[PDB]
Every structure is written in structure tokens, then in C-alpha cells.
Amino acid sequence: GSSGSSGNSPDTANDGFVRLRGLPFGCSKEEIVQFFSGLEIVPNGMTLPVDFQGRSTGEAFVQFASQEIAEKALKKHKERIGHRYIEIFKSSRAEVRTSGPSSG
Numbered sequence: 001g002s003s004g005s006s007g008n009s010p011d012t013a014n015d016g017f018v019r020l021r022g023l024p025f026g027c028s029k030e031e032i033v034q035f036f037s038g039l040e041i042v043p044n045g046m047t048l049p050v051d052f053q054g055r056s057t058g059e060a061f062v063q064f065a066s067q068e069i070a071e072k073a074l075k076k077h078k079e080r081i082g083h084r085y086i087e088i089f090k091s092s093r094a095e096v097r098t099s100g101p102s103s104g
Contacts, residue, residue, distance in 0.1 A: 011067075013067075014067040014070065014092070015063060015064075015066070015067070015092070015093050016063060016064030016065060016066050016067045016068075016069055016070035017061060017062070017063050017064070017070070017090075017091045017092050017093050017095070017096065018061065018062050018063075018064070018070055018073055018074070018088050018089065018090060018091050019059065019060070019061055019088070019089045019090075019091040019095070020032075020059060020060040020061070020062070020086055020087065020088055021058060021059055021086070021087035021088075021089065022058050022084055022085055022086055022087050023048075023056060023058045023059065023060055023081075023084065023086060024081050024082050024083065024084040025056070025084075026056070027048070027056060027058075027060070027081070028048065029046050029048075031081060031082075032046060032060065032062060035076075035079070035081050035086070036062070036073055036076070038072075039064065039069050039072055039073055040064070040065045040069055041062060041063065041064055041065065041069075042063050042064070042065055045062065045063030045064075046060065046061065046062050046063065047060060047061040047062075047096050047098075048060045048061075049097075061091055061095075061096045063093065070090065073088065074088055074090060076088060077089075
């Protein structure tokens with residue numbers, strides 16, 4: 001229960017980043033870009049980490065042109081791609097690790 005924020009204002013903050021969980025085997029942009037059909041995403045605005053050997057961690061970070069587009073994608077939660085439900089959770093560029101201060 002409990003749902004609310006209060007204090008959002010139209011157009012402000014939030015670049016439109018999102019976090020995916022439970023990606024299919026060999027999940028890549030080619031599959032993502034399409035998975036978000038109708039939505040507009042920025043070029044090279046996607047991140048797909050891996051394990052110590054390079055095995056996808058079923059996680060990814062996409063950056064939408066703007067929040068307005070991010071929300072539209074949020075509704076696509078639990079959306080499976082081929083045979084693997086995908087969990088989408090609103091995220092931020094700052095979160096997306098990149099070996100540096102960008103954290104917290």
C-alpha cells in the first residue's frame with residue numbers, strides 16, 4: 001500500500017533512465033530497441049553489464065529521450081521477450097555504474 005510523491009512539476013529532472021531485470025540469453029540492443037517499439041531512445045544510451053567471464057547479468061540500463069518516454073516504457077514491466085519476463089524499474093544515469101564517482 002501507500003503511493004505518492006508530491007512535488008514533481010512538469011518537465012524537470014529525470015533523463016528517462018530505466019533498469020531491466022531478467023533479460024533473455026544473448027539479450028542485446030537489437031532485441032531491446034525493438035522491445036520498446038513506438039518509444040524513442042537516444043543513441044548509445046544503453047548499458048549491458050556482464051559477469052567476471054562476460055556472461056550477461058540479466059540486467060541492463062536504457063536511456064529514453066525524456067521522462068515522458070520513460071513512463072511509457074515503465075508500463076512494459078514484466079514484459080517477456082521470447083520466453084523470459086523482463087522487470088523494468090525506473091532508474092537514473094547516475095546509478096548506472098561506469099567506473100568513477102558517479103554513484104549514490
